[PDB]
Amino acid sequence: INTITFDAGNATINKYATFMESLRNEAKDPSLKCYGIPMLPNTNSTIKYLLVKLQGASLKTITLMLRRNNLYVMGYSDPYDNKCRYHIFNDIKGTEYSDVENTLCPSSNPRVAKPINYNGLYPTLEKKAGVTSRNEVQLGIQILSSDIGKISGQGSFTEKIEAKFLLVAIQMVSEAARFKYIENQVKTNFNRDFSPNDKVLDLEENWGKISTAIHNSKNGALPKPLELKNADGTKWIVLRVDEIKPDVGLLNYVNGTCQAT
Ligand SMILES: *[C@@H]1O[C@H](CO)[C@@H](O)[C@H](O)[C@H]1NC(C)=O
Ligand SMILES: *[C@@H]1O[C@H](CO)[C@@H](O)[C@H](O)[C@H]1NC(C)=O
Ligand SMILES: *[C@H]1O[C@H](CO)[C@@H](O)[C@H](O)[C@H]1NC(C)=O
Numbered sequence: 001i002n003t004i005t006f007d008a009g010n011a012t013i014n015k016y017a018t019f020m021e022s023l024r025n026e027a028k029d030p031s032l033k034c035y036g037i038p039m040l041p042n043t044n045s046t047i048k049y050l051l052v053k054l055q056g057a058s059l060k061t062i063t064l065m066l067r068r069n070n071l072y073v074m075g076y077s078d079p080y081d082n083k084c085r086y087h088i089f090n091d092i093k094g095t096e097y098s099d100v101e102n103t104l105c106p107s108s109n110p111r112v113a114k115p116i117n118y119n120g121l122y123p124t125l126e127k128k129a130g131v132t133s134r135n136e137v138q139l140g141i142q143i144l145s146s147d148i149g150k151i152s153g154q155g156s157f158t159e160k161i162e163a164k165f166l167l168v169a170i171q172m173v174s175e176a177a178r179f180k181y182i183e184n185q186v187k188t189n190f191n192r193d194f195s196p197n198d199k200v201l202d203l204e205e206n207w208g209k210i211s212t213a214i215h216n217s218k219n220g221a222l223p224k225p226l227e228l229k230n231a232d233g234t235k236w237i238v239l240r241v242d243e244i245k246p247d248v249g250l251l252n253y254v255n256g257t258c259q260a261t
Helices: 013-027 095-104 122-129 141-151 159-178 180-188 198-205 207-215
Strands: 003-007 049-055 061-067 073-080 083-088 111-113 221-229 235-240
Touching: 003 013, 013 049, 013 159, 013 180, 049 095, 049 141, 049 159, 061 095, 061 141, 061 159, 073 095, 073 159, 083 095, 122 159, 141 159, 159 180, 159 198, 180 198, 198 207, 198 221, 207 221
Parallel strands: 003 049, 083 111
Antiparallel strands: 049 061, 061 073, 073 083, 221 235
């Protein structure tokens, strides 16, 4: 719907929380809740894309295309050598490739296609970034600002720098809007580059499950215990949604009626 823009060059903790609430406010389906939890809308909606513009300390920018139904990064842009440069993942083609390309790069302005030769799946990025897992790849507000300069406007960048760039951007924008916990981690360490602890990652790989448990779980009694992880790698066992509600920002779409309240 509307282009949300975050400035990682000149940002604070109270600039990130608004951008997140903006993200959350803009990504969420005005009519779909769950235990005081906004839930994302289903595939077919009025609007279907989010535009998030990131400003670098270097003042350069890099835009990002998010499906607002799920919040996966469909493609990112950057003005390079007097034209709109659109980057689309390789498993994205056809018409949704057009809607991604024609959105980031108006079909009336000079454009250059620079294909992403892989997908936006964590094991994938992890392997385009040289890691066996993303926790080896640091996060930070000034890590996203720096990453933006290495890329935006550059005629030549590597796949290593790119997927790592993609690891921190999909984690500091996409995962943090889905998770209050993740947004707090980045907010907690807003001055230091941090390795993401086990709960950041568990929650990442467990959104579909958590959103689903919270959905059909009356009175606050999830359907069956939920196995997660605390920050320290130990096992966490959720039973009631007001238990794992704090950490949740947005709920994935789950067809039907869940306790609105
Ligand atoms: C950052 O934004 C503040 C206001 O939020 C502004 O006063 C300041 O000049 C900006 N910093 C720059 C431009 O280096
Ligand atoms: C979800 O989709 C099915 C598909 O036919 C539809 O019939 C159903 O009413 C929707 N809601 C639920 C709770 O299944
Ligand atoms: C929305 O997409 C089209 C609308 O032209 C149609 O298939 C249907 O209304 C929706 N599609 C699905 C898969 O629900």
